[PDB]
């Protein structure tokens, strides 16, 4: 009987440690947005480019939610949706009576094609969060290092509703820094460093353990 006793003790450890390692993790998080916005029709079927709505990724650290002025310059001429886009779950009248909710937030009127003077913003639900001791900046992490826009937030164009893809818990930031390279070809900031040590030490360096990106004052100060 001791063999099965040991087995159960080992299993017991497994189902405690595993629990504790999955406390501060928010994978596969899906709330209910007040509109039913679809990243699948816009970014996947129409092939709208990814930087269009989310425009602040190049300059600022917060690639924010697009404001309701971007929701009008495409949607002045699109009132109804289609006839070959409604599915088994979603009908045409579900979409047409919900694109009208975009007109109530801005104040657009369908009849005489003019703005009214009553505006209400849309309370979105933010699904990617970090505690506010970290310092992540989208600007020097997309424009400087040429990272593709699906390798951090998942294959976003194949989602009907939005889902958090990665876990963001401090051991995914370190792990992707161990196995990548800084871009030293184009930048003139690296001419003092990259032309050096090719004569002395080596051809290229990783990000984490060489430039110094694993120090407690560069990420949370």
Partner 1 sequence: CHNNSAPNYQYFPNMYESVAYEPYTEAKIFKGGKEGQLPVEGTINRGFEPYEYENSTAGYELAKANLKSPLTEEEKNSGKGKELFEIYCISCHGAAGNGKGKLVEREKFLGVPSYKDREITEGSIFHVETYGLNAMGSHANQLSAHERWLVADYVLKLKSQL
Contacts of 70 (CB under 8 A, 6+ apart): 52, 53
Say if residues 184 and 194 touch (Cβ distance below 8 Å): yes
Site for ligand HEC in 71-130 (CB under 6 A): 71, 73-75, 78, 81-82, 85, 95, 98-99, 102, 124, 126-130
Build a one-symbol-per-residue string for 22-61: x at contacts with partner 1 by CB under 8 A, - elsewhere. xxxxx-xxxxx-------------xxxx-xx--x---x--
Should residue 206 be labelled a site residue for ligand HEC when binding is judged by CB under 6 A?
Answer: no
The answer to whether 220 is annotated as binding is yes
Structure tokens at 190: 């690296």
CA distance 156 to 164: 10
Closer to partner 1 by Cβ: residue 71 or 208: 71
Pick from 46, 69, 87, 111 the residue near ligand HEC by CB under 6 A: 46
Contacts of 159 (CB under 8 A, 6+ apart): 39, 40
Site for ligand HEC in 156-195 (CB under 6 A): 156-157, 162, 168-170, 172-174, 176-177, 180, 182
Should residue 146 be labelled a site residue for ligand HEC when binding is judged by CB under 6 A?
Answer: no
* SS3 sequence of 53-113: HCCCCCCCCCCCCCCCCHHHHCCCCCCCCCCCCCCCCCCHHHHHHHHHHHHHHHCEECCCC
Q: For residue 162, with 0-12 CB atoms within 10 Å meaning exposed, 13-18 middle and 19 or more buried, which class applies?
A: buried
Which of ligand HEC, partner 1, none does 144 bind, CB closer than 5 to 8 A by kind?
A: ligand HEC
**Shortest Å distance, C-beta 68 to ligand HEC:** 7
**Shortest Å distance, C-beta 47 to ligand HEC:** 10
CA distance 210 to 195: 16
Which of partner 1, ligand HEC, none does 69 bind, CB closer than 5 to 8 A by kind?
A: partner 1
Closer to ligand HEC by Cβ: residue 99 or 194: 99
Which segment (1-9, 32-40, 105-113, 194-202) binds ligand HEC by CB under 6 A? 32-40
The answer to whether 91 is annotated as binding is no
The DSSP code for 201 is T
């Amino acid at each position: 009987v001791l063999v099965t006793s040991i087995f159960l003790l080992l299993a017991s450890g497994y189902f405690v440690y595993g629990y504790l390692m999955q406390v501060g993790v928010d994978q596969n998080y899906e709330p209910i947005q007040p509109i039913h916005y679809s990243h699948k029709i816009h970014a996947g079927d129409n092939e709208i480019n990814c930087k269009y709505c989310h425009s602040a990724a190049r300059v600022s650290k917060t690639a924010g939610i697009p404001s309701l002025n971007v929701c009008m310059n495409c949607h002045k001429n699109i009132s109804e949706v289609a006839e070959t886009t409604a599915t088994a779950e979603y009908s045409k009248a579900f979409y047409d009576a919900q694109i009208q909710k975009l007109y109530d937030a801005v104040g657009w009127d369908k009849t005489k094609q003019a703005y009214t003077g009553k505006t209400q913003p849309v309370k979105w639900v933010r699904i990617h969060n970090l505690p506010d001791f970290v310092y992540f900046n989208h600007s020097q992490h997309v424009s400087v290092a040429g990272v593709e826009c699906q390798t951090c937030h998942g294959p976003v164009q194949e989602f009907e509703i939005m889902k958090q893809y990665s876990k963001l818990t401090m051991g995914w930031c370190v792990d992707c820094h161990r196995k990548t390279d800084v871009k030293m070809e184009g930048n003139a900031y690296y001419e003092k460093i990259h032309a050096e040590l090719s004569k002395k030490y080596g051809v290229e360096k990783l990000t984490a353990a060489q430039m110094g990106g694993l120090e407690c004052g560069k990420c949370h100060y």
